[PDB]
From a paper:
The [name] domain found at the distal end of the [name] adhesin from [name] is a confirmed sugar-binding domain that uses a coordinated calcium ion to preferentially bind hexose sugars like fucose, glucose, mannose and N-acetylglucosamine.
While many crystals remained devoid of obvious density in which to place a bound sugar, a glucose-bound dataset was eventually collected and solved using molecular replacement with the MpIBP [name] domain as a template. MhPA14 takes on a beta-sandwich-type fold, comprised primarily of two anti-parallel beta-sheets held together by a hydrophobic core. In contrast, the top loops have similar B factors to the core secondary structure elements, indicating a more ordered region. This is likely a result of the three calcium ions coordinated within these loops. However, calcium 1 –and the three loops that surround it –also make up the sugar-binding site, where the structure of MhPA14 reveals a beta-D-glucose molecule to be bound. The sugar is coordinated to calcium 1 through the two vicinal hydroxyl groups attached to the first and second (C1 and C2) carbons in the pyranose ring.
Numbering used by the authors: 34 to 210
């Protein structure tokens, strides 16, 4: 098992690939029908802010900060961009909660259930997700989708245990195979 989350980056070209990115179902549909343009490992999910489009030349590299060194290639540039992060939560039984600052939207699912989302376009804003209690014996899957419709782009995910303090989400909390 590898520490951190498995990262996938998708270039989306408004026009040829369809309309502006603006909702989770649309983003998920593009992901499901396409192979990622680059992969990476998300060890510390504190990315951006960058301006001039996440899909702009050199921009995903700047956005990913120290995680850029794990990109499999320099993906093609585009108007819009999608990131997916997947792994298993390396957590004992408990009740946890995400807080996310993002531009634009995102959805976090744990064991297939939505636990945080901003289903739309927005300037960078911070939103607290719902408390969730791990259910079943696991592994406890986590799946994050995120997009930039254009302009500025930021994604910072924090995780806490109920009654505790937020920590930047990453290798401390998740692994993948
Ligand atoms: O239009 C609302 C917001 O949309 C975001 O996608 C842009 O990155 C912001 O710069 C803009 O303020
Ligand atoms: Ca590029
Ligand atoms: Ca767009
Ligand atoms: Ca944006
Ligand atoms: Na493409």
């Amino acid at each position: 098992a590898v520490q951190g989350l498995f990262g996938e980056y998708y270039a989306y070209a408004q026009g040829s690939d369809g309309g502006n990115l603006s909702n989770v179902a649309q983003v998920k549909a593009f992901i499901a029908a396409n192979e990622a343009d680059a992969t990476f490992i998300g060890r510390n999910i504190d990315y951006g802010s960058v301006s001039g489009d996440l899909g702009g030349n050199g921009k995903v590299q700047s956005f990913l900060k120290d995680d850029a060194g794990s990109l499999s290639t320099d993906p093609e540039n585009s108007s819009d961009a999608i990131v997916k992060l997947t792994g298993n939560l390396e957590l004992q039984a408990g009740t946890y909660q995400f807080r996310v600052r993002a531009d634009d939207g995102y959805r976090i699912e744990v064991n297939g259930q939505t636990v945080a989302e901003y289903n739309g376009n927005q300037g960078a804003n911070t939103r607290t997700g719902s408390e969730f209690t791990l259910t079943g014996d696991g592994p406890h899957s986590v799946e994050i989708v995120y997009w930039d419709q254009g302009g500025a782009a930021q994604l910072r995910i924090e995780l806490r245990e109920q009654g505790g303090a937020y920590e930047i989400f990453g290798s401390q909390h998740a692994s993948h195979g």
